């Protein structure tokens, strides 16, 4: 047999760098802003494998593989904040930071996968995000973290108990136990966190009308982040908590309707 | 393109005729006219007249509960069309009026803009309504027509007053309170100009090149500002300095309409 292997030139698997939870492997995902990166390499259809980085690691795999900060100040007032999600692609060379970056690499990279985030969307997009920090991410901070945090392995547990305590416990009333316990002052955040997604369906119907993503017919990053948010609490809470059971009831079902958009990618 | 002029309401203020206009509200309506080169003529209303002459004119009220809980609540702008016969209330609405009826003029509010220019509002709202009021609404308070002022104090007190120090003369008096609040509304505007330089360019309005409806509400907050303070104030002059002179250049592009 004179015969030898000639290169494939299919797309290698994306090197997706994630949080893990005390779970095995196939229930380990569960953070908001990794699911954001997840979401959309499995909208675009893009192969990928996930690397596990607890979170007091990193920054310093961050810097070993040259991911580039996410942002400066987070945390320490004068210090560079390292936070996945990051992906390696092996097939450029690359390692992106920062959820809207990784879209933007990937619709400049595959342009042959569904756009996601085009040239016209990225100021609005830019004003959802402080909208949505207020209006969403406040509220929904003080039931997310307390729910995710025990679920951590012990090392990322630690640093996520002390980091997010140190940064709004103190306007949120001191330790985790105490931000929504059950009882009226989780009744009263539970009304403030539904009165939040109202105001959201409320932009989606503005013009009286119900349409299914932000931009009409067609789905956009920013659906993606609500989407991942959602798919974060649903993971966390549990598909039959409660909870979760009413968010699905929420605004005619809207989300029920985008979080079973996004988990058929 | 020969048409009957729109009736434009809009809110007068202590100034001879060509001075009159302030409002932002009703600026975002003006300035969408002009821009689409509608010709139009102002019928001035005082504020405690408007809900007589809206339901005179059969204006819908703009919201419901924003002053007392169980009330129907009218505002201005409005205009009515006579070359329609349809009358319109709330900037958002006339903007979309106008696009239907006028096909030819530049589209201000397509389909694909609605549920973004909704997110904007309330950002705009925290970021920056909530900063500029103690600045504007003391201002103009005093500007009005008797009738308009007593009104204004009344129901803007009665609504933010608690929060903000009572009278408005507490809100933001010279000194260390005016400062930092000086300061808070500096940082809503840069926080609104990174939204448009959140791709590390500097497009001009919030789609790229091409203007659109929430450019027009940016610009009708400002020329509001300026025509309170007068484009001489001090203060004017440091917001047309902000962000490299971005807002300077809106100014520009919307007194050119
Ligand atoms: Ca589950």
Redesign the interface.
């Known amino acids: 047999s004179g015969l030898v292997p000639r290169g494939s030139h299919m797309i290698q698997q994306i090197h997706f760098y994630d949080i893990p939870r005390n779970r095995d492997e196939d229930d380990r995902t569960w953070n908001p802003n990794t699911s954001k990166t997840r979401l959309t390499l499995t909208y675009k259809r893009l192969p990928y494998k996930t690397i596990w980085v607890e979170y007091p690691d990193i920054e310093r795999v961050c810097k070993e593989i040259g991911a580039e900060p996410s942002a400066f100040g987070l945390l320490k007032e004068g210090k560079p904040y390292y936070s996945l999600p990051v992906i390696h692609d092996p097939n450029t060379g690359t390692t992106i930071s920062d959820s809207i970056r990784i879209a933007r690499y990937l619709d400049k990279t595959y342009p042959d996968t569904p756009a996601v985030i085009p ?2 969307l ?7 995000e ?2 949505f920090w ?2 969403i991410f406040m509220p929904l901070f003080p039931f997310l973290v307390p729910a995710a945090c025990p679920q951590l392995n012990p090392r990322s547990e630690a640093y996520f108990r002390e980091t997010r305590e140190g940064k709004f416990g103190s306007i949120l009333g001191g330790k985790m136990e105490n931000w929504a316990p059950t009882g009226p002052v989780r009744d009263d955040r539970w009304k403030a966190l539904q009165a939040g997604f109202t ?1 959201m369906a ?3 119907s ?2 009286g009308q119900e ?1 299914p993503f ?3 017919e067609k789905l956009c990053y920013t659906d993606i982040v609500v989407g991942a948010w959602l798919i974060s609490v649903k993971k966390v809470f549990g598909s039959d908590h409660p909870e979760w059971l009413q968010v699905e009831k929420w605004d005619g079902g809207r989300w029920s309707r985008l979080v079973q958009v996004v988990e058929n990618f």
């Open positions: 040239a016209e990225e100021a609005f997009h830019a004003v959802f402080d909208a207020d209006t105001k409320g932009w989606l503005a013009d349409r932000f931009m009409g």
